[PDB]
Amino acid sequence: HWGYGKHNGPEHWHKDFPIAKGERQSPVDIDTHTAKYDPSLKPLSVSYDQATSLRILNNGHAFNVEFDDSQDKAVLKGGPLDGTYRLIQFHFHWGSLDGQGSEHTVDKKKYAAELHLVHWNTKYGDFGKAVQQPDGLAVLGIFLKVGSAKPGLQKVVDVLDSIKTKGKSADFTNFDPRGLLPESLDYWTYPGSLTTPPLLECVTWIVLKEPISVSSEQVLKFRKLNFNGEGEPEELMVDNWRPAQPLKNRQIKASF
Numbered sequence: 139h140w141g142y143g144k145h146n147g148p149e150h151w152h153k154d155f156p157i158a159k160g161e162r163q164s165p166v167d168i169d170t171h172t173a174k175y176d177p178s179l180k181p182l183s184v185s186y187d188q189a190t191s192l193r194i195l196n197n198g199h200a201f202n203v204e205f206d207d208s209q210d211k212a213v214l215k216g217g218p219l220d221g222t223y224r225l226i227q228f229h230f231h232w233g234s235l236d237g238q239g240s241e242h243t244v245d246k247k248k249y250a251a252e253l254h255l256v257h258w259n260t261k262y263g264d265f266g267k268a269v270q271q272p273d274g275l276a277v278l279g280i281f282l283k284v285g286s287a288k289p290g291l292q293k294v295v296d297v298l299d300s301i302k303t304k305g306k307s308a309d310f311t312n313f314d315p316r317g318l319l320p321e322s323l324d325y326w327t328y329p330g331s332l333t334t335p336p337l338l339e340c341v342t343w344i345v346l347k348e349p350i351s352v353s354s355e356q357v358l359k360f361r362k363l364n365f366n367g368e369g370e371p372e373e374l375m376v377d378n379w380r381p382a383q384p385l386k387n388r389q390i391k392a393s394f
């Protein structure tokens with residue numbers, strides 16, 4: 139029964155998920171002065187040309203755009219990663235106001251939203267096995283700022299009316315996630331966790347330095363979603379972000 143409210147939000151999660159207080163929790167604040175350039179990293183290989191989107195789901199916490207991950211169709215490689223990670227879904231976190239919403243912060247700055255493209259390590263065969271491994275997942279995180287509209291987002295915005303409430307899904311085929319990327323693939327990377335329960339410490343985080351711009355109208359449509367199910371009291375789906383967690387014994391590396 140976890141969520142983002144006063145009674146079930148991030149300050150409560152540790153009671154059911156004690157790893158909430160673990161050594162490699164996400165998100166974190168990225169201190170851009172302390173992050174060290176790691177000339178040994180590599181360029182990110184983002185290979186989304188064959189991506190096959192299937193469906194969009196309101197899961198009561200966010201909405202997920204789901205992909206066919208039954209073969210190596212959309213994969214992330216290179217950078218800090220060893221081997222091949224397959225795209226399974228993307229989702230966002232966003233705020234009630236444009237001054238909050240991101241999970242990661244940059245020198246304590248909060249962005250209006252954050253996109254997470256979730257990928258699993260094919261050496262573990264399936265997502266459920268991958269999340270049990272310290273190198274099981276690679277999540278590409280992209281900040282969103284409010285300014286100009288992001289044309290590649292509007293097809294997502296267009297369908298939200300059809301998945302207003304928890305448990306609703308819609309067909310979402312032929313969506314190209316390349317239209318969500320910024321121009322630069324410069325990034326920060328560190329070892330962390332899922333940012334929602336079960337908070338498993340299985341993620342290599344790759345956070346792009348360049349935000350994408352979306353319009354005020356695009357984000358306002360995110361904020362019309364509901365956390366609740368159909369015919370239940372309306373609770374707007376806003377402020378679905380976990381705040382920054384202790385960095386502990388970790389180093390954030392810069393690709394640039």
Ligand SMILES: [Ir+4]
Pocket residue numbers: 139
């Ligand atoms: Ir309850």
Ligand SMILES: [Zn+2]
Pocket residue numbers: 229230231254333
């Ligand atoms: Zn996320």
